Amino acid sequence: INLQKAWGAARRVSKDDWLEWLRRLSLELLKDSSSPSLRSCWALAQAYNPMARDLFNAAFVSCWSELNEDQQDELIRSIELALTSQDIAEVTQTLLNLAEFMEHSDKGPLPLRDDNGIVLLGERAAKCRAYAKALHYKELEFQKGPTPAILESLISINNKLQQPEAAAGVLEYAMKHFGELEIQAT
């Protein structure tokens, strides 16, 4: 219930402030997680920051389930703002791992703008130099409807993933399972 103050600050502009905001958010979650097991580690979190980073995923899911639709909705738009604000790899990596943890859970991925925000996360991880995650999101978009933009994007990712043969298969897909005289020369 008090996570909104930790989330909704909007006063973070410098890189250090984002780092301070991340540790304040991580510290807040351990304080009230509706589980005595996580509360006991709150004291060590203040005296040791690295032990609180790996507990961010466990703390977040505990509080997120308790909140109702209205409370959890405000968190979602705060996460969207955090993702589309800075370009620091460290901050994005923490949020990227949170999304993957929710997908493996049986409750499904956390809601976002469009289809759990696969489009937003897909282009966000490209600049973070984590192409394993980026390829996964692009394939999810392809399963719904193939488009020339997606086919071009898949070729680029595989080329920088040291898989020249995998990118070759994408071209053959457009040669026969797509309109002719449409493949760009690039």
Partner: protein, 158 residues
Amino acid sequence: VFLLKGHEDLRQDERVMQLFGLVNTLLANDPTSLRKNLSIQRYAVIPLSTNSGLIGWVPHCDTLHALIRDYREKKKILLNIEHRIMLRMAPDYDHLTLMQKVEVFEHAVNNTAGDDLAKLLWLKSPSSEVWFDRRTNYTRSLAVMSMVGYILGLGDRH
């Protein structure tokens, strides 16, 4: 750990293990094949008589049939949904002509989306980096046995 087999002739299996050993050597000294890390997994076969033997136990491996069965039962999905649909549309499936079986078979695969193995391999991957590495090995290891098995003429690959 071994697997003591009875009432089975393992002399033939010993001879095909030697054949796979030759294929591994052939792919080892090929510059275009060595770089892709192509190989065939083998297990020890020690025959003891004309109808007995001793097969080595390969760890960390589970059969495909049991792998799919666990996934479907967890998702509250019947193990033989596809088989039931074919029988529902035509109970005498085993007696239909060649053209009629195609209609029943094609109808079953269209009403059920086959992606159990695709999602199974991802839910067992701790991260996305590991998931991509395992998928690449799976694709290029199934292709090797398909061509080698074709030359050897392997059958009954249930």
